Amino acid sequence: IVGGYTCGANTVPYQVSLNSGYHFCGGSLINSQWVVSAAHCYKSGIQVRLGEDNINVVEGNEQFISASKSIVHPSYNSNTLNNDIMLIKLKSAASLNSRVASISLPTSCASAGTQCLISGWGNTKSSGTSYPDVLKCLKAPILSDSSCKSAYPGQITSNMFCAGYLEGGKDSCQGDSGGPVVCSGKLQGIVSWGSGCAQKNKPGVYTKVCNYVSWIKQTIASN
Ligand SMILES: N=C(N)c1ccc2[nH]c(Cc3nc4ccccc4[nH]3)nc2c1
Ligand SMILES: [Ca+2]
Ligand SMILES: [Mg+2]
Numbered sequence: 001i002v003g004g005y006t007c008g009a010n011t012v013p014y015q016v017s018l019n020s021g022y023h024f025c026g027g028s029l030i031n032s033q034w035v036v037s038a039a040h041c042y043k044s045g046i047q048v049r050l051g052e053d054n055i056n057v058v059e060g061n062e063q064f065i066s067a068s069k070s071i072v073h074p075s076y077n078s079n080t081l082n083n084d085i086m087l088i089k090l091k092s093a094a095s096l097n098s099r100v101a102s103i104s105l106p107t108s109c110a111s112a113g114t115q116c117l118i119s120g121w122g123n124t125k126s127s128g129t130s131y132p133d134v135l136k137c138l139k140a141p142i143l144s145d146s147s148c149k150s151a152y153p154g155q156i157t158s159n160m161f162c163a164g165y166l167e168g169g170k171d172s173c174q175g176d177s178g179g180p181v182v183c184s185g186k187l188q189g190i191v192s193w194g195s196g197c198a199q200k201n202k203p204g205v206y207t208k209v210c211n212y213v214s215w216i217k218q219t220i221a222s223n
């Protein structure tokens with residue numbers, strides 16, 4: 001996250017860190033047994049870490065649970081990143097408490113202008129590499145589809161939306177990938193892609209979760 005701030009320990013209780021020997025992507029806990037992340041974060045051998053703040057220090061509120069199965073969206077296109085969403089089932093149910101809670105799925109899609117909270121342990125430099133150990137947060141509004149499409153001609157589908165600042169300076173970045181974009185108490189986006197990080201007229205692009213609610217509900221109920 002570039003131009004963001006330290007969230008504070010466990011202030012984003014539905015945020016998960018996907019670990020395969022090191023942190024490589026974020027995710028969102030949707031109920032005690034399932035996590036939603038981005039399909040471009042797919043790997044074999046994932047351990048989900050809940051209740052984290054500093055990912056390099058066991059502070060006491062963590063739960064490390066391995067994944068039993070991963071399901072990448074049936075129509076995910078790795079070349080365009082269209083349908084960039086994946087579901088991960090935990091081997092054991094997590095214990096939900098104040099530090100570990102699930103986030104709600106949306107009943108409708110959000111309007112441009114709505115302010116959201118994006119979080120992650122991804123890179124914090126636009127020009128450089130500085131990876132933080134504690135969770136970073138960023139409040140950003142959803143941008144109109146017009147400004148999103150003008151920035152990326154022929155690359156935005158109806159399953160994506162842009163959020164951010166056209167002036168540059170504030171954005172999510174690699175490592176934040178798969179993480180949550182919460183607006184009005186609902187998970188509305190998943191950190192997906194962008195052009196570099198925090199560049200002018202290159203806002204972040206997010207998977208539009210409101211278009212996948214039936215798929216998510218149907219898939220978790222049958223697995
Ligand atoms: N500017 C953005 N809003 C942005 C978000 C996410 C992202 N993701 C990548 C590529 C990317 N994602 C990953 C995940 C894990 C290892 C490497 C890696 N590279 N660029 C970006 C850019
Ligand atoms: Ca920790
Ligand atoms: Mg994240």
Ligand SMILES: [Zn+2]
Nearest residue numbers: 174175177192
């Ligand atoms: Zn990524």
